[PDB]
Subunit: 462 residues, 4 copies
Amino acid sequence: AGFTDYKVADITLAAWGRRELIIAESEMPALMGLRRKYAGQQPLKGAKILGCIHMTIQTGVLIETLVALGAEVRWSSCNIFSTQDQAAAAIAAAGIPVFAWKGETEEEYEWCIEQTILKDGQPWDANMVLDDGGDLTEILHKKYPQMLERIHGITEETTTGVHRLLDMLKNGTLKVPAINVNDSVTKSKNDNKYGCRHSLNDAIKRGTDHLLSGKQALVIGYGDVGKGSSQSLRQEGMIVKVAEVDPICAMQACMDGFEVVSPYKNGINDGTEASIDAALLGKIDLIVTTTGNVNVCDANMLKALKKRAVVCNIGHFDNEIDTAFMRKNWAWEEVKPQVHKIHRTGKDGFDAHNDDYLILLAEGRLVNLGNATGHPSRIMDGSFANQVLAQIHLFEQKYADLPAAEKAKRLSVEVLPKKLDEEVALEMVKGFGGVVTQLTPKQAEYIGVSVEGPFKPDTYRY
Amino acid sequence: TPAGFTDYKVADITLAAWGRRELIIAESEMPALMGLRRKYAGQQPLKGAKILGCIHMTIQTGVLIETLVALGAEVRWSSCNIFSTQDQAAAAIAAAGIPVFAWKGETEEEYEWCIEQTILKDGQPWDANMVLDDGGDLTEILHKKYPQMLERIHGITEETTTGVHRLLDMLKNGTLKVPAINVNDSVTKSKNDNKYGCRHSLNDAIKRGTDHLLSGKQALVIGYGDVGKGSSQSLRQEGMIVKVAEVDPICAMQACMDGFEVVSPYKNGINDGTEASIDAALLGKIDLIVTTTGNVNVCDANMLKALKKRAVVCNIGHFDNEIDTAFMRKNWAWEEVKPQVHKIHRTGKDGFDAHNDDYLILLAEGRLVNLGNATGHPSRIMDGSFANQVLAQIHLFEQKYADLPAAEKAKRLSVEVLPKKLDEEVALEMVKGFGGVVTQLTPKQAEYIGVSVEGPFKPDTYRY
Amino acid sequence: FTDYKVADITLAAWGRRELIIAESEMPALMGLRRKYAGQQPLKGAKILGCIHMTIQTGVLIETLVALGAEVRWSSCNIFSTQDQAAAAIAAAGIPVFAWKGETEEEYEWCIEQTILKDGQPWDANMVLDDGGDLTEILHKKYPQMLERIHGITEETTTGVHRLLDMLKNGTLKVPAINVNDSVTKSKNDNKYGCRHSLNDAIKRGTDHLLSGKQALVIGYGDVGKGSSQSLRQEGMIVKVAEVDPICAMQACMDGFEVVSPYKNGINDGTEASIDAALLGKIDLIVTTTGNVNVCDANMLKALKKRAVVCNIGHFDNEIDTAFMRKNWAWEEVKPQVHKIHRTGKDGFDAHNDDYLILLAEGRLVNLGNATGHPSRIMDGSFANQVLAQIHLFEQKYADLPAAEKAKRLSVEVLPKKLDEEVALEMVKGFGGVVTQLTPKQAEYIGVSVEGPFKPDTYRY
Amino acid sequence: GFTDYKVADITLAAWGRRELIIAESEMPALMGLRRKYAGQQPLKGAKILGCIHMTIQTGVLIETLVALGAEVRWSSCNIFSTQDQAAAAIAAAGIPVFAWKGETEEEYEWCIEQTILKDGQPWDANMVLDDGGDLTEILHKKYPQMLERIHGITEETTTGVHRLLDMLKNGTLKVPAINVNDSVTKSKNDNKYGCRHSLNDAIKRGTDHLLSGKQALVIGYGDVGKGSSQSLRQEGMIVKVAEVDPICAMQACMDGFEVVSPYKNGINDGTEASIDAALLGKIDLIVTTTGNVNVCDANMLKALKKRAVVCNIGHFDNEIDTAFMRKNWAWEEVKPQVHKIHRTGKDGFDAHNDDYLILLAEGRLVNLGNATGHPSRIMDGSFANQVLAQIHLFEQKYADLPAAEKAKRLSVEVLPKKLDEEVALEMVKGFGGVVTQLTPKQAEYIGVSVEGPFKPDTYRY
Ligand SMILES: NC(=O)c1ccc[n+]([C@@H]2O[C@H](COP(=O)([O-])OP(=O)(O)OC[C@H]3O[C@@H](n4cnc5c(N)ncnc54)[C@H](O)[C@@H]3O)[C@@H](O)[C@H]2O)c1
Ligand SMILES: NC(=O)c1ccc[n+]([C@@H]2O[C@H](COP(=O)([O-])OP(=O)(O)OC[C@H]3O[C@@H](n4cnc5c(N)ncnc54)[C@H](O)[C@@H]3O)[C@@H](O)[C@H]2O)c1
Ligand SMILES: NC(=O)c1ccc[n+]([C@@H]2O[C@H](COP(=O)([O-])OP(=O)(O)OC[C@H]3O[C@@H](n4cnc5c(N)ncnc54)[C@H](O)[C@@H]3O)[C@@H](O)[C@H]2O)c1
Ligand SMILES: NC(=O)c1ccc[n+]([C@@H]2O[C@H](COP(=O)([O-])OP(=O)(O)OC[C@H]3O[C@@H](n4cnc5c(N)ncnc54)[C@H](O)[C@@H]3O)[C@@H](O)[C@H]2O)c1
Ligand SMILES: Nc1ncnc2[nH]cnc12
Ligand SMILES: Nc1ncnc2[nH]cnc12
Ligand SMILES: [K+]
Ligand SMILES: [K+]
Ligand SMILES: [K+]
Ligand SMILES: [K+]
């Protein structure tokens, strides 16, 4: 009532979004348990959170949990294609500043982040940052250092964002402490792996409706995302080959029943077309990049791929595939939103019945969020419970209020304690109806733990 | 071969030629280990090493032993389990002139005597300077009974999760006398051996012991660590309906996401010591229970009383006390079907009806079932574990802890893992053994993610 | 051209882009275009067609037209049409009456618009049907039209059942081909199609995580087999119900627990017969039977709160949706997704926790909440359809003397050689290479190098 | 003083009996028939020549036939498939059996002849139970006068049924037969799921090789090839499938396998040049499943990757050209039923030669040769069908019919679907499964009886 501090595609989608938020709450017991547990305490009272993460229904439940615990927020998405417009509308209609829609331009994307940072033309009195991929963190460090003086911490969602934070810490340019939310086991080995297992074949089916059974896939990478991606395709009946630079990850792919191959002859990427295994790439129906690295599906790979193969990326940033090369040299035909045929016959025009094209999904951006709805609520429950606990921890530590000598001792990138990781996990297990056994005192003594946990040393890999 | 060689004890030396044939095949399945042989034989990095070894005397252990010898070591060997030896492996090693005391089906008394035969030579302590152990039993006997021998020993290389736990307790209590390398927690060990090895060998052992169809039947796996993960997959891939018990909610979360129902033998997960706390409806539907925990009494007497008639009971953790077999020895009549397979008749202690329908089938008398009823992990998986073992032996032997002044000894008394670079190099050889091709980063790519082109590729915190 | 009714003709360009992609996914059907285009075997055919107006059906329609036929087309389900496909067909000058979200009355009107042209019965002479509704309307309401029709080609298990009942009763008036029971139809479509498209539809409709949750699949025929796999491969804990013990044996061997919603399997009509403990743990129930009331009112009352309920059999009476309409309040989440509030009939609390989620109002969920089977699977079914249309049209039953008709009035299948030829084109679409027997090897196993490679009794 | 047998070691009998008692608890359909029919003695007067793998599972079948009143004389249908403790237990029960693991081909023939003859003269046989058709062939070729008094043959396996249908076509089949193979509770239980259980079992027992991550080629994708492909894929192998039947190949593709041919463009012209050497050089394991001849031929064997494993799970050992390997290459026995074949030549071998293949069971049925064949709970279905087929043909009394009526009954038939379903129901109850009962309204709706049969005879499952 009088609220205009937002920008979304269509505010009238709010009732639809609210219906889906009410369903999603029933799928997110760890997050909803934190609401119940901390509602009276209001641990985020006085927190003012700049948030930059995919404006989905799941992020909706995260936002309203932070608000229910006392926080004020200003929100944007961390990707131009990942917003669910009904989710953004429901948040805006609740009176929460959100600047996000599906299908932003790069200029609009940056404008949206700037609308969270500034309120009424001046820096908002922010004191906390929640980020997915590091874009908001980078803009604050480069353009708003005075704001960081009053910010107590950053809670960072994803592998790429943490790598950026560690580079800043190494270079002495990180200005506030961070929690690496990614490396909770209830994030990394739930979201990154099982979330992509669910949502990769989901996005491919929505975008192309292609049969996957019996066809040949190449997954570039076998980290947490590459593992879940390979399972997403293999469980559909795809014949999956895996590429890797890490021999330990490659070993896992072999033992998991995949053939390990390289796009390059003997794995040597010397920049020549001669180095491409053309016989291999000419048999591939689907390539998926999962690395967080640059140019792992390069121009010469794209030139050699089988006619009508599907090309997509589920890493955080669109530079895993050389889409710039495709924009410069080949003609793009939109099939429908986030689905383009790339005609390898030339740049100027195309024949509508040309057989020599590739299908690119989400213009090379995160395909699970761009062509579907990303991870399901019950998986995001784990990631976002960690986010709320991380926000509580850094806000209560009050880094910005500490003397300089004390700041120096606390300026770090840390993970949440294992005990909290376990508490998130138990809520997830209860949501499945699972029943965990309680150790007897003698059994706890025998393996050297407290009955209530933690149950594993910090070195344990799960 | 050595003339007059008698410094061994095995079941049947005539199996040696068969053992040797299998060692030659196994060498072709163990490229990381054989690559170490080829790379280091001329350097002789273990020349002067005198290694006491205690680990399952299988064909795979034979390839490890002869790798250490080829690098210059002398060894004296025993098995770390009474049922895990392959007698043809023991025979081939003995026939090669290597002291080995090991056979399938030892008594507990014979088991201890075999370890002591490695420790002693001609009635007196051998001048050992290295220890290679699997489960901690040899480590324990040396500290307990021959503490003076530890004054000349440079290190212990410990293979398995249970043994590392014992070393860490000793370290924290000030009772560990020499430094050790935790071989178990190399990724090419723990996440290869413990998981994939059990995937291969659990269903193998159940089939050899019982020849039961597994598809369509109900299993309960106690534990979902690395062994529990691999065990659950061994059964699920055969078509079993697998339920998983855990005390660790993170491991339980993984089981749910992996497609398993998580359940407890106890109502509400609480064991109050009474029969009434047992979920009798659940246990009365289970055809197979497998313990994987490294913990004590996780398949207890009340659970055994509640199990469905003719269910199979087995343990793939390191020690037999996961299952309360002592209760079953005390109260129920054992009928041997064949070696390492017993029907346990719940009708009473004194005799049994040959056609009684109320029995359980116990495999390997509750000892490690993959080694007891089959041959344990396959060579190509043990390649990773045993390559790490050789590298750990070389590292500790070259460090020469026993020759350091006591000040430097306090600074080095630790339980360490091998560096990730070595872990990666073992993995690369394994991948090449499958014919896999690892891609090489470009310089720009390596800069982009902040690694060297040669690795390591992951920070030490990475969990894979 | 105005002889059509679709949701939005401006979607035609989009539909045409998707048809061009689908053609590249349907090698058996496009091979039939290439090999029969010269002969024009359907020249003079006037085909009434009633099947889901999807992109895949568009490629089928345009194949029939490419071989010489005229058609008039409708969907066989109110929710299965892809509006861009109908638009592209209408824009091509082909009469089609079909949109996503028809009412039952509009559904019947659409079939009647294919039957009538300019207020009079079209001079149709062939029938292509999926489910038997068009076949039924012709026999009951326009029986004189059947005197000019040479044959019916029926797509699905339910429709074949209806054809056989009519043949047994002496009420079938023209010969038919059972397309369903080509192996490249039944053992491709019914099973593998549902494997692809069931989890697809559930994700699109709910975006629920399936891994770790409990499913109950009612039925384990071809659709139940593919459905059970669609869920188990996502990591669901799947239980299977069956009345057929052979199918139940397969479910056990395939690694599923076989259960009944009723104590000891006995459905005696009472709430007391419901296994309430079982149903109270189920997160998802899927019906696959082609039978009536296999997810009944007492089961729906006993289901776990917030369970998803859906049907992938042909007709919406597998679930007792009428009971839910009568007794419980429906809250639309979005098209083809309803929360059914078990708290009562008149109104609901927006935050009530005691609801079920029904997909597609109990209608075919893969077509209702997603896009049905994928092109490369529908390729097998629709190549068989084309071959069956060619066969019956060239036979010209409607022109035979009465004595020759009596010996021709049957429900037949296509010869195994054609089944094998469809399969060969599908295998080449995957890049697979089929080996050729040597003469000695063919002699050894008692077949021709040319095939057929199996007796008609072989079950694959 | 019972001496009418020949087994490896009669002192194994107590061990065999312990395993039979366990197996009975795993075979509820077969033991159900025992309890149902023991009082009626439907096989009283039956005198059955039996030729099928002398396993523990066959022991339960034999003792079911005897419990129902039959007398039998038994041999194995494969030289490597007998479980010697099973044979001993049967012989110690006073049942004539001539079978041991590791027969020569001459011993194999002699064992069949010992069942046919008693005291040097034809036994008064009147029923035949066969697996593969060898006993059937010897009777037609050498003992036609015995067939005049035989009421029928119950044949277990695909290859034997083919041999029966050839005789029927040629007019040389002398007695009617039941095709036991094509019950659904046989073909789509035993042939498929039995090989799923027992193929990777035999490979592990023979080689202890890791299978995960390695490349397999399965020749054939019928019932045995389907189960064999699953046996390997579920272990983590990368499995490729070859087929001559495009419908079976379509199934392999849709089931998630790559379909390949050993021959370039699938053309087997007999030349080395036709071999896809790149493909064969990547294969770690080849398994033949076809019932055909020479599907793993000499040129494939020459092209295979060094140290690949070669085995056959079809009925006969000519699927692999082992004759070529005997003639050209040196064989080194690793242990019983496991040989290294050294491709370096015929005259001896280097013990450390790297260029060898590993052949299992000398190319004979690998699941029975290197392990124990299918498990009891699967053989329960096949062998309940066998008992029911024996009862049916014995009660028909074909040998006693007039010539004109014999001509009308000389056929190869399957059991009716109601029997198939009742066998399946007992199997499902053995898993604890609960089948639902149709209401009258539902039965009318789909047009079946509440008790079944639930499917038309054309249904393929
Ligand atoms: N789309 C999603 O929902 C989602 C979810 C989580 C993470 N992510 C993103 O996905 C990316 C990967 O994350 P992760 O957690 O799997 O990281 P990870 O470190 O666990 O895995 C990345 C893998 O890529 C491999 N790799 C790097 N360069 C390669 C090359 N040239 N060829 C082949 N393999 C190569 C590395 O060896 C590594 O194993 C990051 O950008 C992360 O932020 C996306
Ligand atoms: N047989 C083999 O070849 C083999 C191979 C490797 C390791 N092991 C042995 O197996 C055991 C387990 O090894 P690991 O590497 O899997 O260890 P791990 O710590 O990774 O897993 C053990 C799991 O057991 C769970 N657990 C403990 N007590 C429990 C209880 N009461 N109920 C249910 N779950 C319980 C723990 O939470 C833990 O996740 C050790 O004894 C190890 O030495 C055996
Ligand atoms: N949605 C799709 O894309 C699609 C595709 C093909 C077929 N169908 C339809 O799906 C239905 C099934 O087709 P099908 O080919 O699998 O038929 P089918 O005969 O192969 O299988 C139906 C199964 O349901 C079982 N069944 C019947 N009543 C039952 C009950 N009360 N409880 C449990 N099981 C019961 C039968 O025993 C049988 O095995 C038909 O209506 C068919 O037209 C839908
Ligand atoms: N070992 C066992 O326990 C066991 C069990 C059952 C049957 N069998 C035997 O296995 C064999 C196969 O039985 P089945 O029931 O699977 O028969 P089947 O007819 O179902 O399958 C055999 C398949 O082999 C294919 N084939 C034939 N020649 C081929 C070639 N040159 N290349 C590739 N594929 C080729 C055929 O197309 C067919 O699909 C028979 O000999 C049978 O008696 C063995
Ligand atoms: N085969 C094997 N040899 C030695 N140690 C083992 N641990 C597990 N399997 C083993
Ligand atoms: N165990 C077994 N017994 C008899 N015949 C068989 N055929 C396959 N496995 C068998
Ligand atoms: K989602
Ligand atoms: K082994
Ligand atoms: K579709
Ligand atoms: K067996």
